[PDB]
């Protein structure tokens, strides 16, 4: 069905992304390095979680055992922290690149990017295997995998927004003396709206009764919520070279 | 190879009309911007007008708009300039000179001091 | 005296002892085909042998 | 000026005398006489290396005489010899002018030279007892950039210049000891004769020249091209060479004929040539674009054999070995690529 | 280009020792270095070396956990940081330059050497360890290798060094066929694997010395018996 | 790999760190082509280099200055710089036309039509002079002046003559007209009043730079 679809789509588009990055020294910027990441993320997603829940909805029973839930739990976990900080550090990286253009090479190095990256990835590991290794971890891991990102993603963006709309006019006044809003909105909006009713339900769990939120409708969000590891490919990989070696590769 | 001739250049009366005459060889004429270059006694080149590919865009020096008037004939591979009310200040060796490649909007060095493309110059004297 | 220069190189490259051009054709064609054995571009080179 | 008008009818007169003269001698073309062989087929050549490290457009490159090592010049400042074979960088020659145009190798090895909008040729000592690469001579002289240069031995180096000359130099000296006049333009490219007794030269003039070393005088002038002539070759047994210019076409000229003898262009092809070579036969004639695109052309029968695509910008330089196993293309998106 | 070595001196049977090679004349960061022992009844012997950069070091089995090799680009420096100093460790320590790209010459200077004095390798064979010769005559010596040479890149690491009496040995022909800059072009290379031959038409005097064949194949680096050539 | 063969590779690899390191002080480098004419008066603001460092960021502007007059080939080697700085003499009106030709052909050049210009009006005391002396008259050399009006969002010093004004602004427009013309925005113009005892060049430049620079990553954002 559409699960399969999915799951090939998903594979198939972060491992070219991956694959199209290693290969052509032109996209091996700063910012395909944090792009990098997310595509390692998503495709570990597509890998070894959605099939899995697709196996467990099927059979009702996850077949590995007692071991296996709790691995299949702590990945899903480290995968989707991963997958929206790396989103939180390419806003940022967008943020020192339009804010501070002349300073952004200095700023934002490549021993910087590595570090950034290993760090994303240590907190996200932390965070899921936090039970394990050692209502409260409900909140606090939904409020540091979620909601401070999208607090720094909505800063970032707003100020980017408003710099570029203010240069748009500007340029708009200077050739009348003789598009960021889709951009942005697409960048947050399919973020938020994939994310935002899964950990709005994960709070709710906590903070008061479950019940409030059968269980149904929660692993229909959290299916939701899978989505977005599809959609990032055709989100942060249309620049024209991008395109350019996605052409040369099938191709070849 | 390249050529340019340039005609049409004599002696006139202040207030008189000249036409001058520029035929092309050993290029495709179609395909270059083309200019007019005067060279007044005593001074250097100046520019004075120029005709497009197409002859769609036309622009001119300030000290001749409304007086001189340049057309181009492709089929002909020659060059027009039609000058009129003419005053001493005209007094110059008019040149026909030709942008260095072709389909281009951009044109270098037509007035520079040795320039392959461009003709030996027609004398053009407007005296009483 | 730059017209005398120009004319003076212009009599020298008068006194050219020109040849036919399918004389020059001819032997554009005979070292072609004579040294097209030795040319790895012309017949792709099998990989044993290829240094790249 | 009645005495100019003179001087104007004679030479009108002997250009109408050397255009009969070789009208006479046109009994037919050269595809005329080779209509009858066979195509040379389709060429398909593929990537076999890409040398990566220059930090920006490279700009020239020249292959050494063993057909393994090669230098690149680009615009950061830097010169680097490569190791083709296994991709090793042998040398980096830091340049104290980042506008270099022009680099070349000796073919004995032990030099290099290089120069551009500094209007000096730099020559470079690559075998020192120090183990480092030092700067021999500076060439000075030269009213204009360096275009082209290129060694005849250890110690004779002929460069092209934007003053509309070019330049005999005698390196132990410093001192040039002839000088190469009659261009109208700036001189773009120069092709050394196999035997190094003459060499043709390309300037911004719509035409090109054929010099006598010795004796330091032009020869013969061939004035087929439209625009400004950007590269020359010469053919590989020193009877004809090949021209690239921005009117997007390539031309063959006959030296004892004295006249073209074949166009290289189509009605879709409308960029201008950066580069010609030709393969070690000379059957091929490669000629690199303005469109990041390099064409292989059937060089007796005119027809497009091949590209060489893969490139991201303008194609800048090409090159052959001398044993002809090989190509080198260089280009704006500082890489090189070897191509078979 | 100058190599200049001291720190050599008499140390008990056992104790600590080091050595410094002190470089002027040439970059000396570009280059790699060797340590080269002589022992007074013995040939050459490879001991130690560190690449250019420090990135790489080797060292010979015999000094492996006594020796250490060290550099100071700053100051042009070489050490060798030797401990547990043995009766087998008397000899003199050479400080040898050595380039490493397509087409150098490594082993090309040789410094002058400090004496100092305690209180799967393939096997160098070179036969006729004495050979009286004439001036104006033409003599010819051979080096064999226990195990071929060529690499099936072209090139056969067979190098000769020629030491004078008294003097430090110096580069003749390296890669087994190249003539080193500043030899005369009398010295003539050739062979095949495991079977080299040099050749020197119409010797002359300052000839006359030992001749070692050095391999550059596997890095445990062994030299020749040497031929000694007589009058 | 032979023992050579590997110390050959470790250099090469030192030689690629060299290059990184040579690499980041590349990138932190903007290179600007100054551009003018021998009254310009651009040597105030044969190559004559200069280095400055204004806000911790360095600029480097090159003069190429031993050349002959045409410059339709050696022009292709600075493509890639931020910015090209064009001086114009404010005053001269015989030569006005020239320099807009100059400016005409580097906006619509093929391999110059990425690169944004800051235009530099050079002598306005010497312009403030000439207009108010009454003598010369722009009229002669353009003659539509006769039917320009100051801009609506024009900033004249106070004190300052509305005919220096009206004369300023015609000027500056006049070079405007040709930036506005193509280029579709993928470059700018970005004009400045300039004088002989200016010290605020260094800045200016800056400014313009930043600005460059930010609309380029603006644009290649999809942000525009
Ligand atoms: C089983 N579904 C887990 C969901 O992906 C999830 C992700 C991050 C979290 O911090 C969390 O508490 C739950």
């Given at each position: 069905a559409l699960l399969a679809l999915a799951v090939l789509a998903t594979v198939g588009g972060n491992l070219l992304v991956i694959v199209a990055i290693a290969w052509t020294p032109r996209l091996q910027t700063m910012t395909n390095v944090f792009v990098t990441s997310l595509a390692a993320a998503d495709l570990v997603m597509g890998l070894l979680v959605v099939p899995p829940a697709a196996t467990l909805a099927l059979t009702g029973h996850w077949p590995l055992g007692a071991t296996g839930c709790e691995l299949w739990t702590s990945v899903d976990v480290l995968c989707v922290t991963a997958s929206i900080w790396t989103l939180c550090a390419l806003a940022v990286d967008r943020y020192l690149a339009?804010?501070?253009?002349?300073?952004?090479?200095?700023?934002?190095?490549?021993?910087?990017?590595?570090?950034?990256?290993?760090?994303?990835?240590?907190?996200?590991?932390?965070?899921?295997?936090?039970?394990?290794?050692?209502?409260?971890?409900?909140?606090?891991?939904?409020?540091?995998?979620?909601?401070?990102?999208?607090?720094?993603?909505?800063?970032?963006?707003?100020?980017?927004?408003?710099?570029?709309?203010?240069?748009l006019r500007l340029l708009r006044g200077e050739l009348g003396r003789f598009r960021a809003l889709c951009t942005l909105g697409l960048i947050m909006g399919t973020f938020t709206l994939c994310w935002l009713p899964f950990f709005l339900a994960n709070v709710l769990r906590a903070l008061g009764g479950p019940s409030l939120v059968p269980g149904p409708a929660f692993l229909a969000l959290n299916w939701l919520g899978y989505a977005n590891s599809a959609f990032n490919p055709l989100i942060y990989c249309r620049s024209p070279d991008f395109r350019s070696a996605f052409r040369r590769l099938l191709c070849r | 190879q390249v050529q340019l001739?340039?005609?049409?250049?004599?002696?006139?009366?202040?207030?008189?009309?000249?036409?001058?005459?520029?035929?092309?060889?050993?290029?495709?004429?179609?395909?270059?911007?083309?200019?007019?270059?005067?060279?007044?006694?005593?001074?250097?080149?100046?520019?004075?007008?120029?005709?497009?590919?197409?002859?769609?865009?036309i622009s001119y020096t300030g000290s001749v708009k409304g007086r001189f008037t340049i057309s181009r004939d492709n089929a002909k591979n020659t060059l027009y300039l039609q000058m009129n009310s003419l005053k001493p200040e005209d007094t110059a060796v008019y040149y026909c000179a030709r942008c260095p490649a072709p389909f281009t909007r951009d044109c270098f060095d037509v007035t520079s001091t040795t320039y392959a493309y461009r003709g030996q110059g027609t004398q053009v004297t407007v005296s009483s | 005296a730059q017209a005398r220069k120009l004319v003076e190189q212009l009599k020298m490259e008068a006194n050219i002892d020109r040849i036919k051009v399918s004389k020059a054709a001819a032997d554009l064609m005979a070292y072609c085909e004579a040294h097209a054995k030795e040319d790895p571009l012309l017949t792709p080179v099998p990989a044993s042998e290829n240094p790249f | 000026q009645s005495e100019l008008d003179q001087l104007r009818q004679?030479?009108?007169?002997?250009?109408?005398?050397?255009?009969?003269?070789?009208?006479?001698?046109?009994?037919?073309?050269?595809?005329?006489?080779?209509?009858?062989?066979?195509?040379?087929?389709?060429?398909?050549?593929?990537?076999?290396?890409?040398?990566?490290?220059?930090?920006?457009?490279?700009?020239?490159?020249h292959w050494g005489t063993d057909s393994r090592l090669l230098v690149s010049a680009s615009q950061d400042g830097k010169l680097i010899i490569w190791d083709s074979y296994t991709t090793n960088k042998v040398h980096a020659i830091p340049l104290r002018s980042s506008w270099v145009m022009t680099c070349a190798y000796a073919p004995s090895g032990n030099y290099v030279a290089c120069g551009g909008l500094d209007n000096i040729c730099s020559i470079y000592n690559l075998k020192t007892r120090e183990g480092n690469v030092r700067v021999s001579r500076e060439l000075a002289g030269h009213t204009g950039y360096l275009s082209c240069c290129r060694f005849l031995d250890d110690n004779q180096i002929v460069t092209s210049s934007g003053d509309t000359t070019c330049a005999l130099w005698d390196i132990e000296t410093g001192q040039?000891?002839?000088?190469?006049?009659?261009?109208?333009?700036?001189?773009?490219?120069?092709?050394?004769?196999?035997?190094?007794?003459?060499?043709?030269?390309?300037?911004?003039?719509?035409?090109?020249?054929?010099?006598?070393?010795?004796?330091?005088?032009?020869?013969?002038?061939?004035?087929?091209?439209?625009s400004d002539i950007n590269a020359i070759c010469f053919f590989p047994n020193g009877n004809a060479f090949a021209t690239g210019s921005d009117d997007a076409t390539c031309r063959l000229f006959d030296l004892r004929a004295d006249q073209e003898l074949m166009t290289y262009s189509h009605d879709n092809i409308i960029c201008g040539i950066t580069s010609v070579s030709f393969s070690k036969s000379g059957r091929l004639l490669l000629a690199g674009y303005d469109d990041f695109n390099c064409n292989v052309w059937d060089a007796l029968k005119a027809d497009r054999a091949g590209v060489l695509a893969g490139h991201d910008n303008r194609v800048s330089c090409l090159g052959v070995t001398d044993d002809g196993m090989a190509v080198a293309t260089g280009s704006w998106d500082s890489f090189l690529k070897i191509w078979n | 280009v100058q190599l200049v070595e001291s720190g050599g001196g008499l140390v008990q049977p056992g104790g600590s020792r080091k050595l410094s090679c002190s470089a002027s004349g040439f970059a000396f960061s570009s280059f790699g270095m060797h340590w080269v022992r002589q022992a007074p009844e013995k040939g050459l012997e490879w001991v130690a070396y560190i690449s250019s950069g420090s990135g790489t070091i080797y060292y010979a089995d015999?000094?492996?956990?006594?020796?250490?090799?060290?550099?100071?680009?700053?100051?042009?420096?070489?050490?060798?940081?030797?401990?547990?100093?043995?009766?087998?460790?008397?000899?003199?320590?050479?400080?040898?330059?050595?380039?490493?790209?397509?087409?150098?010459?490594?082993?090309?200077?040789?410094?002058?050497?400090?004496?100092?004095?305690?209180?799967?390798?393939?096997?160098?064979?070179?036969?006729?360890?004495?050979?009286?010769?004439?001036?104006?005559?033409?003599?010819?010596?051979?080096?064999?290798?226990?195990?071929?040479?060529?690499?099936?890149?072209?090139?056969?690491?067979?190098?000769?060094?020629?030491?004078?009496?008294?003097?430090?040995?110096?580069?003749?022909?390296?890669?087994?066929?190249?003539?080193?800059?500043?030899?005369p072009d009398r010295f003539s290379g050739s062979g095949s694997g495991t079977a080299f031959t040099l050749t020197i038409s119409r010797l002359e005097a300052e000839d006359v010395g030992v001749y070692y064949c050095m391999q550059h194949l596997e890095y445990p680096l062994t030299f020749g018996a040497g031929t000694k050539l007589e009058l | 790999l032979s023992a050579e063969d590997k110390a050959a590779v470790e250099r090469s690899?030192?030689?690629?760190?060299?290059?990184?390191?040579?690499?980041?002080?590349?990138?932190?480098?903007?290179?600007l082509?100054?551009?003018?004419?021998?009254?310009?008066?651009?040597?105030?603001?044969?190559?004559?280099?200069?280095?400055?460092?204004?806000?911790?960021?360095?600029?480097?502007?090159?003069?190429?200055?031993?050349?002959?007059?045409?410059?339709?080939?050696?022009?292709?080697?600075?493509?890639?710089?931020?910015?090209?700085?064009?001086?114009?003499?404010?005053?001269?009106?015989?030569?006005?036309?020239?320099?807009?030709?100059?400016?005409?052909?580097?906006?619509?050049?093929?391999?110059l039509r990425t690169i944004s210009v800051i235009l530099f009006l050079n002598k306005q005391d010497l312009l403030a002079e000439k207009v108010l002396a009454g003598k010369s008259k722009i009229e002669d050399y353009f003659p539509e002046f006769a039917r320009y009006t100051t801009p609506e969002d024009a900033t004249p010093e106070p004190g300052e003559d509305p005919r220096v004004t009206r004369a300023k602004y015609f000027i500056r427009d006049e070079f405007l007209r040709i930036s506005t013309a193509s280029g579709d925005g993928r470059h700018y113009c970005y004009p400045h009043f300039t004088c002989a005892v200016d010290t605020e060049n260094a800045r200016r430049i800056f400014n313009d730079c930043r600005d460059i620079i930010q609309r380029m990553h603006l644009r290649q954002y999809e942000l525009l």
């Open positions: 339009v804010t501070n253009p002349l300073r952004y090479g200095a700023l934002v190095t490549k021993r910087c990017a590595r570090t950034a990256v290993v760090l994303v990835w240590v907190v996200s590991a932390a965070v899921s295997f936090a039970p394990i290794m050692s209502m409260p971890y409900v909140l606090l891991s939904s409020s540091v995998s979620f909601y401070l990102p999208l607090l720094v993603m909505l800063f970032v963006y707003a100020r980017v927004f408003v710099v570029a709309t203010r240069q | 001739q340039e005609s049409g250049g004599g002696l006139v009366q202040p207030g008189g009309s000249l036409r001058l005459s520029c035929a092309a060889s050993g290029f495709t004429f179609s395909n270059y911007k083309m200019n007019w270059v005067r060279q007044a006694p005593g001074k250097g080149l100046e520019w004075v007008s120029d005709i497009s590919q197409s002859g769609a865009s | - | 004679e030479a009108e007169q002997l250009k109408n005398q050397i255009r009969d003269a070789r009208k006479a001698c046109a009994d037919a073309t050269l595809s005329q006489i080779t209509n009858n062989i066979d195509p040379v087929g389709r060429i398909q050549m593929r990537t076999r290396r890409t040398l990566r490290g220059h930090l920006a457009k490279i700009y020239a490159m040039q000891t002839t000088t190469f006049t009659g261009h109208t333009g700036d001189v773009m490219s120069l092709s050394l004769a196999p035997d190094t007794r003459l060499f043709v030269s390309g300037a911004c003039d719509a035409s090109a020249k054929l010099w006598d070393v010795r004796e330091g005088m032009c020869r013969q002038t061939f004035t087929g091209h439209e | 015999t000094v492996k956990g006594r020796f250490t090799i060290s550099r100071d680009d700053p100051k042009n420096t070489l050490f060798l940081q030797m401990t547990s100093l043995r009766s087998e460790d008397t000899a003199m320590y050479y400080c040898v330059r050595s380039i490493y790209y397509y087409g150098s010459s490594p082993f090309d200077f040789w410094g002058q050497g400090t004496t100092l004095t305690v209180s799967a390798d393939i096997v160098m064979t070179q036969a006729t360890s004495s050979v009286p010769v004439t001036p104006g005559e033409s003599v010819s010596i051979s080096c064999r290798s226990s195990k071929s040479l060529l690499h099936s890149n072209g090139n056969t690491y067979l190098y000769w060094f020629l030491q004078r009496p008294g003097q430090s040995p110096q580069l003749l022909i390296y890669r087994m066929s190249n003539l080193a800059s500043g030899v | 690899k030192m030689i690629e760190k060299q290059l990184q390191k040579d690499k980041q002080v590349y990138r932190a480098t903007h290179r082509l100054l551009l003018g004419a021998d009254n310009s008066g651009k040597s105030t603001i044969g190559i004559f280099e200069t280095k400055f460092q204004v806000d911790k960021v360095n600029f480097h502007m090159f003069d190429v200055g031993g050349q002959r007059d045409e410059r339709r080939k050696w022009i292709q080697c600075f493509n890639d710089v931020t910015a090209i700085i064009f001086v114009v003499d404010s005053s001269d009106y015989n030569r006005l036309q020239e320099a807009l030709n100059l400016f005409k052909s580097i906006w619509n050049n093929r391999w």
